[PDB]
Design a protein around this motif. Structure first.
Motif, PDB file in Angstrom:
ATOM      1  N   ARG A   1       0.832  -1.213   0.000  1.00 36.43           N
ATOM      2  CA  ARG A   1       0.000   0.000   0.000  1.00 36.43           C
ATOM      3  C   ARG A   1       0.860   1.255   0.000  1.00 36.43           C
ATOM      4  O   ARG A   1       0.611   2.186  -0.761  1.00 36.43           O
ATOM      5  N   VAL A   2       1.877   1.268   0.854  1.00 38.87           N
ATOM      6  CA  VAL A   2       2.752   2.430   0.976  1.00 38.87           C
ATOM      7  C   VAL A   2       3.544   2.612  -0.321  1.00 38.87           C
ATOM      8  O   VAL A   2       3.665   3.721  -0.850  1.00 38.87           O
ATOM      9  N   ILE A   3       4.062   1.513  -0.855  1.00 41.94           N
ATOM     10  CA  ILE A   3       4.814   1.583  -2.100  1.00 41.94           C
ATOM     11  C   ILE A   3       3.954   2.073  -3.263  1.00 41.94           C
ATOM     12  O   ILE A   3       4.407   2.879  -4.073  1.00 41.94           O
ATOM     13  N   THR A   4       2.714   1.593  -3.347  1.00 40.14           N
ATOM     14  CA  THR A   4       1.802   2.064  -4.385  1.00 40.14           C
ATOM     15  C   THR A   4       1.570   3.562  -4.272  1.00 40.14           C
ATOM     16  O   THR A   4       1.438   4.261  -5.279  1.00 40.14           O
ATOM     17  N   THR A   5       1.520   4.049  -3.041  1.00 39.17           N
ATOM     18  CA  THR A   5       1.339   5.468  -2.800  1.00 39.17           C
ATOM     19  C   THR A   5       2.554   6.250  -3.317  1.00 39.17           C
ATOM     20  O   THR A   5       2.391   7.262  -3.997  1.00 39.17           O
ATOM     21  N   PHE A   6       3.762   5.773  -3.018  1.00 40.42           N
ATOM     22  CA  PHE A   6       4.979   6.374  -3.577  1.00 40.42           C
ATOM     23  C   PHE A   6       5.026   6.277  -5.105  1.00 40.42           C
ATOM     24  O   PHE A   6       5.462   7.204  -5.797  1.00 40.42           O
ATOM     25  N   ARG A   7       4.608   5.141  -5.642  1.00 39.42           N
ATOM     26  CA  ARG A   7       4.698   4.914  -7.080  1.00 39.42           C
ATOM     27  C   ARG A   7       3.769   5.844  -7.858  1.00 39.42           C
ATOM     28  O   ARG A   7       4.148   6.382  -8.895  1.00 39.42           O
ATOM     29  N   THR A   8       2.553   6.027  -7.347  1.00 39.64           N
ATOM     30  CA  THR A   8       1.505   6.742  -8.087  1.00 39.64           C
ATOM     31  C   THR A   8       1.195   8.159  -7.630  1.00 39.64           C
ATOM     32  O   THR A   8       0.646   8.948  -8.399  1.00 39.64           O
ATOM     33  N   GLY A   9       1.499   8.477  -6.374  1.00 40.51           N
ATOM     34  CA  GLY A   9       1.158   9.772  -5.821  1.00 40.51           C
ATOM     35  C   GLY A   9      -0.345   9.934  -5.665  1.00 40.51           C
ATOM     36  O   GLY A   9      -0.855  11.060  -5.618  1.00 40.51           O
ATOM     37  N   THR A  10      -1.051   8.805  -5.600  1.00 40.60           N
ATOM     38  CA  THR A  10      -2.494   8.791  -5.394  1.00 40.60           C
ATOM     39  C   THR A  10      -2.840   7.903  -4.212  1.00 40.60           C
ATOM     40  O   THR A  10      -2.006   7.145  -3.730  1.00 40.60           O
ATOM     41  N   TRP A  11      -4.090   7.986  -3.775  1.00 38.84           N
ATOM     42  CA  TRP A  11      -4.567   7.179  -2.663  1.00 38.84           C
ATOM     43  C   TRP A  11      -5.222   5.871  -3.103  1.00 38.84           C
ATOM     44  O   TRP A  11      -5.961   5.262  -2.332  1.00 38.84           O
ATOM     45  N   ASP A  12      -4.940   5.428  -4.323  1.00 38.76           N
ATOM     46  CA  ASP A  12      -5.608   4.241  -4.864  1.00 38.76           C
ATOM     47  C   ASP A  12      -5.516   2.995  -3.975  1.00 38.76           C
ATOM     48  O   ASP A  12      -6.463   2.204  -3.911  1.00 38.76           O
ATOM     49  N   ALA A  13      -4.386   2.815  -3.296  1.00 40.14           N
ATOM     50  CA  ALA A  13      -4.195   1.633  -2.457  1.00 40.14           C
ATOM     51  C   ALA A  13      -5.033   1.655  -1.181  1.00 40.14           C
ATOM     52  O   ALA A  13      -5.200   0.620  -0.539  1.00 40.14           O
ATOM     53  N   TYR A  14      -5.519   2.831  -0.798  1.00 38.90           N
ATOM     54  CA  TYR A  14      -6.236   2.978   0.465  1.00 38.90           C
ATOM     55  C   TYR A  14      -7.740   3.121   0.266  1.00 38.90           C
ATOM     56  O   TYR A  14      -8.518   2.951   1.205  1.00 38.90           O
ATOM     57  N   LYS A  15      -8.144   3.434  -0.959  1.00 45.13           N
ATOM     58  CA  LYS A  15      -9.566   3.618  -1.275  1.00 45.13           C
ATOM     59  C   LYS A  15     -10.543   2.443  -1.022  1.00 45.13           C
ATOM     60  O   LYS A  15     -11.628   2.613  -0.587  1.00 45.13           O
ATOM     61  N   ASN A  16     -10.102   1.245  -1.141  1.00 48.13           N
ATOM     62  CA  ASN A  16     -10.840   0.083  -0.662  1.00 48.13           C
ATOM     63  C   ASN A  16     -10.365  -0.374   0.713  1.00 48.13           C
ATOM     64  O   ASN A  16     -10.434  -1.558   1.043  1.00 48.13           O
TER      65      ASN A  16
END
Ligand SMILES: CCCCc1ccccc1
Length: 164
Positions: A148-163
């Motif tokens: 989740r944290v890495i996805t946040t760094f990778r994308t600069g979005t909250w996509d990993a936390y939205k679900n």
């Protein structure tokens, strides 16, 4: 989403002393009490942190107060760290949350071996940083949270936390 919502998802909320993923006595929203194996030592630390005799249990408000203190400490720690501050300042708001999340979980000694990842983040080489970040004990021991944290760094979005 903000850093409080993000960490609340990652750490949960427990009002009685529990052991964290590493086996350390903790309470509230990931508030580490001690690395000592002694529950009595943890209870002492809790009473000291809260300012009353808690007998191992706190209220939700008390948990949220410790959480505010811990988040603030994490951020101030970054700003006081000569290695971390420039990278943090270079990041956008969402990625700054990912940074705080990591420091909250592992402290500054715990991120000490991340020199190469820090460089990639400062260079905005997001996919490269993401790959590098996963080559870590951190990723292997808490893969769901790290992803989740890495996805946040990778994308600069909250996509990993939205679900959640
Ligand atoms: C990956 C290094 C630890 C988390 C972090 C990343 C950028 C800035 C400050 C802190």
């Amino acid at each position: 989403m903000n850093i409080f919502e993000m960490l609340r998802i990652d750490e949960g909320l427990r009002l009685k002393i529990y052991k964290d993923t590493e086996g350390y006595y903790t309470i509230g929203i990931g508030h580490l009490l001690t690395k000592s194996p002694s529950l009595n030592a943890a209870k002492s630390e809790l009473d000291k942190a809260i300012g009353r005799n808690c007998n191992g249990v706190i209220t939700k408000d008390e948990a949220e107060k410790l959480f505010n203190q811990d988040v603030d400490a994490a951020v101030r720690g970054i700003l006081r760290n000569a290695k971390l501050k420039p990278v943090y300042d270079s990041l956008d708001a969402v990625r700054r949350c990912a940074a705080i999340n990591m420091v909250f979980q592992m402290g500054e000694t715990g991120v000490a071996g991340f020199t190469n990842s820090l460089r990639m983040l400062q260079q905005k080489r997001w996919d490269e940083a993401a790959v590098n970040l996963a080559k870590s004990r951190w990723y292997n021991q808490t893969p769901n949270r790290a992803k989740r944290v890495i996805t946040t760094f990778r994308t600069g979005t909250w996509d990993a936390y939205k679900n959640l």
